[PDB]
Symmetry: C2
Subunit: 514 residues, 2 copies
Amino acid sequence: ERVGEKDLRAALEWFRSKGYLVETNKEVNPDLEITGLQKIFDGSLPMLFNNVKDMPHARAITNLFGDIRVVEELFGWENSLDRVKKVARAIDHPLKPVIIGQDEAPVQEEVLTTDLDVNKWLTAIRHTPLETEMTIGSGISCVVGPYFDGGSHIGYNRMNFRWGNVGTFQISPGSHMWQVMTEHYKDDEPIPLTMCFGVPPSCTYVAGAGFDYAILPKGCDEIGIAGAIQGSPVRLVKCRTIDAYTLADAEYVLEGYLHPRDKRYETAESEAADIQGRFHFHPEWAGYMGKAYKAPTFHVTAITMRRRESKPIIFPLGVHTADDANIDTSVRESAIFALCERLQPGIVQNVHIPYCMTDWGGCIIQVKKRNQIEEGWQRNFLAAILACSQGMRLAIAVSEDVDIYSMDDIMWCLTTRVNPQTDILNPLPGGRGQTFMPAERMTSGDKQWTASNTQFEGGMGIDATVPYGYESDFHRPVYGVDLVKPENFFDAKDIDKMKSRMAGWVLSLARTGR
Amino acid sequence: ERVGEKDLRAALEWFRSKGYLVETNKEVNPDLEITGLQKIFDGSLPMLFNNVKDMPHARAITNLFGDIRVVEELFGWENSLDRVKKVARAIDHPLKPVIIGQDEAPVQEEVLTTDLDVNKWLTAIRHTPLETEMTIGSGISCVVGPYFDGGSHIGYNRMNFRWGNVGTFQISPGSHMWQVMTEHYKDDEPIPLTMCFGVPPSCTYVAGAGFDYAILPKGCDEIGIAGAIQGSPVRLVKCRTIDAYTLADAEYVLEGYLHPRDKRYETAESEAADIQGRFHFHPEWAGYMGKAYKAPTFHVTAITMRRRESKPIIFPLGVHTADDANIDTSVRESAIFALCERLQPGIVQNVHIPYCMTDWGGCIIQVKKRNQIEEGWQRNFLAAILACSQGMRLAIAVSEDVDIYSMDDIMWCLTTRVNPQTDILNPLPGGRGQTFMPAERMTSGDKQWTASNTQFEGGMGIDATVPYGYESDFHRPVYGVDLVKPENFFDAKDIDKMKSRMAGWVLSLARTGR
Ligand SMILES: CC(C)(COP(=O)(O)OP(=O)(O)OC[C@H]1O[C@@H](n2cnc3c(N)ncnc32)[C@H](O)[C@@H]1OP(=O)(O)O)[C@@H](O)C(=O)NCCC(=O)NCCSC(=O)c1ccccc1
Ligand SMILES: CC(C)(COP(=O)(O)OP(=O)(O)OC[C@H]1O[C@@H](n2cnc3c(N)ncnc32)[C@H](O)[C@@H]1OP(=O)(O)O)[C@@H](O)C(=O)NCCC(=O)NCCSC(=O)c1ccccc1
Ligand SMILES: [Ca+2]
Ligand SMILES: [Ca+2]
Ligand SMILES: [Fe+3]
Ligand SMILES: [Fe+3]
Ligand SMILES: [Fe+3]
Ligand SMILES: [Fe+3]
Ligand SMILES: [K+]
Ligand SMILES: [K+]
């Protein structure tokens, strides 16, 4: 039980071989140093901390998915478009996970069944100095089998263990865990599930997915999609205590039960005066400071991990980082692409969810109309995307002469290609939204800022595409950037001196010439 | 090659055993008698005509799917709700079709490779006296394999063979045949496909499906869904001439090639003066008289059929019949149910598309809100249904105290439960619609009434549901219809005399007491 063929340690070895690994040996605080160093180097190389404060048996990795280029190099993709198409193909073709014995799983070298103090072994962090609680935000849930209709689910859930071996368990309403909890709410037996830590990067990648249930409904095989992404099946193992399955190649696994009707407060102040949605609880995906709520409790029965002499790795990450944004929006991009290809194939060329929009709030699709009969399909695509995403606030459709990765080019399409009377779609006013957007706090009024009181404004679908047959009038003004060579006119020093000053939309426009 | 284990002949034997079969021996005209007798007995028992005018080798069945109760008795379903749930389960679990040899397929007893006059063997009908052409509207297309991404497609296409062995081939834009034609438009080799006639009733049932491609995308297995519906795999056989596969247990098969870039007019008058969308071409699904268009040509290379001494059965049906409505809207109902269950399970209770709405224009879903967090999901459902259906004009969401099969009860919900300022959704103005609705002719103007010139008004999503927490104010007024027995007060004669006068919404209200 010491090999994990494709896991976090092999990924660290590949990162060290490629030269992408930044590793230090100095003792780092989980309090306001890991997330601070992650935000200082946001969207960059992975950082490995060998020594963690008050965690003598644990290492810590961060910014693992921060640069999307090294992630695409890890999984063998050339660019983001190839990544989107390959992960859509992997969604439609899962690899069924294999079950190995309880003696070759590396996560079951040490099995703690007593003295269950989760905060002693797992590294809880604080993100900002405005917080009061150190929370565990590193684990993915793992529901395999009868509670997920014979499929499998992996996904992140934040936990605050402020009762020793009992901690809160934050569930987004509408998610797969919400659907499992809603089905088994009125039950006597609690839901058995495991929280896995230091998982293979494919499992992190698929655990980022969410609110894409027209493509990945309840009963799908998310671990199958992770196995299809890494190109080999993800190994499972039966738990020691509960009746479930874990990722065998993880670094830590918490086994236990979820009690849905046992709801407790996440912080001490919101418990002190009984108010959800007011007190600060570590910044959220929307790009604002989060709020503390009531949440069901996760009753840990066993802590299994690797050997503490091997120093198992945990992956703590801040929420408003490019790390967290890549983790969610990559597989959500390919799911949106899959839905638009299902509705009408051959029209959508590329789907991109930038860091700027949010995890669950926005997307940009790029359509190409081949004839007059395909005119109008972008409005079907925008309405279907906004309806099938639960609280996406802004979907933008652009034409094929646009750089989809530049927000300056998107703003140019918003300025020049949008009729404000006809091209703004508000499809579903009064539907379901995401309560973590404070624009829905503005609709709750003086009631409690919970999901029961918010009112969704309906989303915003912006059709910034060129009408068919008007491609000559909306033609983009390509210059002669390949008809002239600057090496004739200037030397190397003038050329790189002028090239060092360019940044952004000029860098996008100088490649394309438009 | 004389057994078809589950096919049209075995279904006729079961209908005769149950007493549902109405069979005559008098010679019926395909000109204005078959569709007339079908409309006289619309929504009733199957009619079998042994002698057809100028078709001495052919029998004709009609109103086969006219009564939905005998269809549910044929496939083993108790009511329509069980049918919707079972066909949704069959959609998510197809049975892979089997391939049998060319000598046990009953449709290949007689293989005609010369003298290909399709109108000599296949029965073309005229529906109304306003028409001029007798068209073939009995066959389903069958694309299996590489042209459908390794999946299979079955679906109806009307054909008018006015060049001997070359006929038009009407394709709805957006359909599976449209997607196949759009992918292989710019190709030199024509698309090989077979038109199958007198197919098993499961294949007719699944061939009715259309514009449900979030659930049944390109590359799905529609013959697999037919095999899952009948409970045994549908047998296939390799063609004699072209490189394709047919339904082995059919009665007639036309083998040939589809030429997409060879477009010809459907009638003689529209060919005479070059106008699509004006001249009458046999009433359509919208409930209006249809129009003649240009269409790609189907070049028949071989006619294979059963033995002419066995008198193979064809199934001609009028378009504005309950037959045709059941055929499309049954599997489309279960597809809409599957999509709403994928987005958020446990909320939608029942989906119904009545005969009154249309084939592709409307649907009624019935939701049940279990808590405050599920309030608003019906608007997501309405927007997703209207976006993922290509030109559904009217989707209505009602609560669970409504009889979904009574249009009077739906009109009552429209009167009493709709806020006209907030509960009318217009999600996708300017999207793709269905050109056969003349409300989109009103938007084409003085241009040609084609799909290239219509402008969709956006659909109409009506939220007629009760808001959560106001179930006491919107409570339906249940009387004491089971507290009193009429057999005490009156005799049998007064009771059935009073019961014979009740019809419609009073019949719905007297069962429920509301
Ligand atoms: C949505 C709740 C949980 C609603 O609680 P409250 O309003 O306080 O109301 P209650 O709790 O009292 O229950 C009401 C009554 O209804 C019933 N009932 C309830 N549930 C169910 C059920 N499932 N099934 C069936 N029934 C159910 C139940 O009977 C109950 O009555 P009882 O309890 O029997 O007396 C609220 O706590 C909240 O706002 N959570 C935060 C929402 C959120 O957005 N989290 C996002 C995290 S993602 C983010 O971190 C992230 C993303 C990406 C990257 C990074 C980060
Ligand atoms: C939609 C068309 C086919 C458009 O034709 P038109 O407007 O005359 O225009 P054109 O034909 O000239 O082509 C334009 C140019 O664009 C190109 N291009 C075209 N296509 C493609 C392609 N696929 N892929 C790629 N490219 C394509 C092509 O280059 C072409 O130029 P060329 O040809 O190279 O010079 C029209 O004929 C029509 O309205 N059909 C009826 C629509 C309908 O609703 N049928 C519903 C039946 S269901 C009902 O029966 C029913 C349902 C349920 C129960 C019962 C019953
Ligand atoms: Ca992204
Ligand atoms: Ca129906
Ligand atoms: Fe999941
Ligand atoms: Fe526009
Ligand atoms: Fe099909
Ligand atoms: Fe209402
Ligand atoms: K996920
Ligand atoms: K079909």
